[PDB]
Design a protein around this ligand. Structure first.
Ligand SMILES: *[C@@H]1O[C@H](CO)[C@@H](O[C@@H]2O[C@H](CO)[C@@H](O)[C@H](O)[C@H]2NC(C)=O)[C@H](O)[C@H]1NC(C)=O
Ligand SMILES: *[C@@H]1O[C@H](CO)[C@@H](O)[C@H](O)[C@H]1NC(C)=O
Ligand SMILES: *[C@@H]1O[C@H](CO)[C@@H](O)[C@H](O)[C@H]1NC(C)=O
Ligand SMILES: *[C@@H]1O[C@H](CO)[C@@H](O)[C@H](O)[C@H]1NC(C)=O
Ligand SMILES: *[C@@H]1O[C@H](CO)[C@@H](O)[C@H](O)[C@H]1NC(C)=O
Lengths: 490, 482, 481
């Protein structure tokens, strides 16, 4: 006649690691790391990304005429720029503060294009010949649709020209202009005239006065001339004045815009945009998951889990899985099934397995709480950003990089280390819970049963089902069987 | 006759959390997080902050004439700017590198104002008409007290003008100038003259050369003109040369300054400045605490505890409070209750109580020790063309805050669970030390107590406590009773 | 007749700390922190650093004529600038974007100097009088070897001058120029001429047009004039055009360069450069170690361990050393001491000793594995107008340092306590395996040993060790006693 203390086992082959031991098979586990993504770009909070097609952010916003598919009012949750986009700044030159412009654009929600300065604002000049082979449209010469390249009428001098616009709305306005620099004085004379020339732009809060910076330079996109492109934001209430007597690339169309209530982004990617929705949209695809870590990409919008370098974060929730009557010391019981820890008895009324409800449940609750506590404490994300840096910003670019890789290494370490350490605790907690049941039984039976050093106890007497249950509920009664016992123990 | 092993309990209702379970009542705990502050600004290392009143940092340092209350020599542990301050850059324009100037000013300790270039320096020009309705003083037109707005005499051309100053002291000098930009060529001709005009400033180590950038603009503060304001530091030994034939807003008064040996700050706040002292002064008030974390503010000067987002960090120092436990023990944490013919009573086990007290006190102090650093967020400012480094700074500051908060919260949960396991084990040890000694001269009861099969006097009971029991002496008397 | 359960001890005096107690002596420990360095500069991936001697990075790269020891093709894994170097920008003025130039230079691995614009490119001007007392060479007046200071011939006007160069290679080219600003109109007229003057430089991707900004300024290095120095990179394929009628300090020699596949650095240090190799080279010396943390310096190139502020990170790998414990055990960590009529002796329990050795070894390696990453501080420079990003960089670097230090110190304290608890438990297990087997055929003694109520031969004692004891066989003989 006997009773054993033992623990659950099953067919699982899932392994976890601990600080002490690797490749340890367990009965139950939860993987905390999401590794799967849909390789595409989806809507976020029901708002679609803007596909720039064969255009760059600059070609788009300056209105390169090969970018007409994007022309006009648009709204977007994020921007998708194709890596090999060919249509950008077609007439050669520099966009001043280009990287800050992109940051601005990435924080914008919606834009509304409108005519800020119609051609009629500039009088005594040629508003219809401002085109170049560098900016083609259907093979012929053309120009940015948001800028107007004014030149003199052949017969007349380039008169002083003036224009004003007042932002009377509540939305800020993003607008552009340029100064054209011919490669020599002959072209300068032809297009604008000799003498001092200036482009002046004035606001309540910005002031601008510049002239041609003539110089012979090698051709870029077929052109020896250049344009310095500038951008600015006319704030609500502000008024802009424009004066020039030459070399002005005037603002034509501009954008009333709103600033997103959400984090946005410009993704440089070739992934397709499809008709789908995503809670979490990363640079390298959409994630749909309840998990709390993620090794897909550090760059995203929406609500994503923390990025880490890990290939897995398998957290043990069950016991060491070790199958082979006999109790816990020789392994686990595939036959238990009921629960995690329990008993196996054998008397004249048969035999069988039964879990200890109370200790199984107390352990389930502690583990469930542990998991939720981990989920809770990992419920923040460091958010890397794809801002851009010029060739003269190596230092802050490197600063940003070291910072982003810094937090990635700390969080990866934190996550990996936590899983290793708590797994060891989880498995020790099992060993102890089993020990507790075994010891609750041992203390009760004293010398009315033999230990066997094995997890089971052999009764020195008869133990019916009502006796065996009296051991489970912890109300055994040593004296009743003490005499019967001692006679067989001697 | 009997002896029991048990543990302490009391009237405490304080709860802590562990990784395994929540809302666990304990006998003793220490709260590690400071959440209280005095909503005011105090002295730090016995030096008072500077209240800028109705002035902004810029109005102050350029000497806006409505800011005369701040004019002259000053010194401070930190600066308090009022959010709604109205007197700043009164004549419209831009202070170049304004944000870097503020960082500088925040690292300054004391300033001494002095006349760098008196009016007599500039000859053949009008040094007495340089005033505007935009910078008013008692209703009349005026101008910044640290700058001089020079224009031509009506009859004469604006002559080339020159001035030099040499810093012969050991203190650096902070000084200001500007270039005035009229809105059109007519005003330009009136005030300075036509042709190329320049403002040139030179030093052993810096140079500067700029002209008017004339342009039609809308009025701001009633004026279509603008001034680009500039600042710089003339180092000890250096000499400054100034040369212009127009558009120069010349330096007039400047500041010899010293750099603080301590971290300083500019707080934008409406909190009152009072006659008090603070070891730790945050943007949102003063903290006086021995605690090691703090959820008041990430921005401070003085010696503050680490900022975290947590609402509490309650660390268990005692046992699970379950009255189970013995409210009657009082002596210590773990111990005994005996009963014989000489009475009964409770008594703690000194040695195991003390060993556990020392381990916990060490744990607390070890935590305090390892958390004895602070990440220090700074209130530097960023222009509208510095969105990227501004965002970089923000993500960094929040980055450390999230790692330290996680570190702190997680540590408390994990070590609380260890603390409470250690109690369970210590109690079990005493019980087992007793059991092994008595063997079958006493009955277990499965209950924590032992019923003696014999008489056990106080001398016997004490022999069990000190671990020198003597089974054979009572073995006969014992075995017969069963 | 008896058997005891006990644990190892030895002569070790090494101490570790735990979260619960301090100065705890243990039998074995591993120090995880490297504190030793060779105070010198070594080769890294077989390439030597470049010693700038008495020259600054700027004097070197502009070709200050007192820096001829460096002149020409060079290559390096890192640059060592001496703190007290005196030869830099000798004619007074400002190198634009100097700090970015240094970052560039730190990322370069080899340069090849060549004549970009020979003197013959500039016609109708004086290409042979461009010298100053501020830039001396053997006592006489001279000038940077990579720049040409052109002035007018006395009799003639300064003609418009032109030059072009096209980068037809695959390597980028680093080059320099300047604009000279005289201190007054008389010197201006003398050297270049009156009227508007300009210096124009053009490329497919950069445009430059500036004039003299004449002003009297106090003398620096004996000179009231100034030069604004500029630098740029002509990319492969690009072509540079130069046009001026005055005030041009022309490019003369420039550098084709290659970009390092590795992190480089400019170290400001007086440490000697020697014939050695270093896997890890820090600003304050070379480290050769297998350890995983390091308190030598946060600045390095090569493969270094993680920098921390700690003075030590001693991890317990053995037991509490308390000779209590058995100096006589030697075999292993946990075991037995028996005594019968066939003698006495000590013997370790192989299975439980080995399981503990493996768990600890794994713990150490796991720690090593998880700490196998480094935050890398950099010595980029910041101007006096970059206090904010300089402070941002500083707070960031000290931020990670504090987090990693905390992580490392805290981990050692916590795992040391776990390590020492695991020993206490393993010993207790052996003791309780033996107790359950013997029941009342032996006496506990409350002491760790068991006194047998019967005779226990070596075969009996081993039957206890292997866990197959046989209580009934000796139960009668026992009960008699
Ligand atoms: C995130 O981790 C997963 C695995 O946990 C990586 O995906 C595996 O990569 C291997 C080796 O290339 C493939 O053969 C397996 O098919 C992948 N496993 C799964 C489940 O997809 C993945 O590369 C990691 N992500 C990133 C961006 O590095
Ligand atoms: C713990 O107690 C608080 C009240 O202090 C209560 O709001 C909360 O719901 C409790 N949590 C759990 C898990 O019982
Ligand atoms: C922590 O401080 C916050 C400040 O954000 C305060 O409102 C709150 O009451 C604090 N939490 C607790 C539990 O004191
Ligand atoms: C142990 O602690 C004391 C101070 O409490 C210290 O003086 C002593 O040097 C320490 N020993 C070691 C080996 O660090
Ligand atoms: C590193 O720690 C060691 C002690 O292990 C000490 O001798 C040394 O001062 C430390 N080095 C530095 C640079 O702080």
């Amino acid at each position: 006649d006997k009773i054993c203390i033992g623990y659950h086992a099953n067919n699982s082959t899932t392994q976890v690691d601990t600080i002490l031991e690797k490749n340890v098979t367990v009965t139950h586990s939860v993987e905390l790391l999401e590794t799967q993504k849909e390789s595409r770009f989806c809507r976020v909070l029901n708002k679609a990304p803007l596909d720039l097609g064969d255009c760059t952010t600059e070609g788009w916003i300056l209105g390169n005429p090969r970018c007409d598919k994007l022309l006009g009012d648009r709204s977007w949750s994020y921007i998708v720029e194709r890596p090999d986009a060919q249509n950008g700044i077609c007439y050669p030159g520099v966009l001043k503060e280009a990287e800050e412009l992109k940051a601005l654009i990435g924080s914008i929600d919606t834009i509304q294009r409108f005519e800020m300065f119609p051609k009629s604002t500039w009088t005594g000049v040629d508003t219809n010949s401002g085109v170049t082979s560098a900016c083609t449209y259907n093979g012929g010469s053309s120009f940015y649709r948001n800028l107007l390249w004014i030149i003199k009428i052949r017969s007349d001098p380039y008169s002083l020209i003036k224009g004003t616009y007042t932002n009377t709305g509540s939305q800020s306005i993003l607008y552009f202009w340029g100064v054209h620099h011919p490669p020599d004085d002959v072209e300068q004379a032809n297009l604008y005239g000799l003498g001092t020339r200036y482009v002046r732009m004035g606001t309540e809060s910005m002031n601008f006065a510049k002239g041609p910076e003539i110089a012979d330079r090698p051709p870029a996109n077929g052109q020896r001339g250049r344009i310095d492109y500038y951008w600015s934001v006319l704030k609500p209430g502000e008024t802009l004045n424009v004066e020039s007597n030459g070399n002005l690339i005037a603002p034509w169309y501009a954008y009333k815009f709103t600033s997103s209530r959400h984090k946005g982004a410009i993704f440089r990617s070739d992934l397709p945009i499809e008709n789908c929705d995503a809670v979490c949209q990363t640079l390298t695809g959409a994630i749909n998951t309840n998990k709390t870590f993620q090794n897909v990409s550090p760059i995203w919008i929406g609500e994503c889990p923390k990025y880490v370098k890990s290939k897995s974060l398998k957290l043990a929730t069950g016991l060491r899985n070790v199958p082979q009557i006999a109790g816990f010391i020789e392994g686990g019981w595939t036959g238990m099934v009921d629960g995690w820890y329990g008993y196996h008895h054998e008397n004249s009324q048969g035999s069988g397995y039964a879990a200890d409800k109370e200790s199984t449940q107390k352990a389930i609750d502690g583990i469930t709480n542990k998991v939720n506590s981990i989920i809770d404490k990992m419920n923040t994300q460091f958010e890397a950003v794809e801002h851009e840096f010029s060739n003269l910003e190596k230092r802050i670019s490197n600063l940003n990089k070291r910072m982003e890789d810094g937090f990635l290494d700390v969080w990866t370490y934190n996550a990996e280390l936590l899983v290793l350490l708590e797994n060891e605790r989880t498995l020790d907690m099992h060993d102890a819970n089993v020990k507790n049941l075994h010891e609750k039984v041992k203390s009760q039976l004293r010398d009315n049963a033999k230990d066997l050093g094995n997890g089971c106890f052999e009764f020195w007497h008869k133990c019916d089902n009502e006796c065996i249950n009296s051991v489970k509920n912890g109300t055994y009664n040593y004296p009743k069987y003490q005499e019967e016992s001692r006679l067989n123990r001697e």
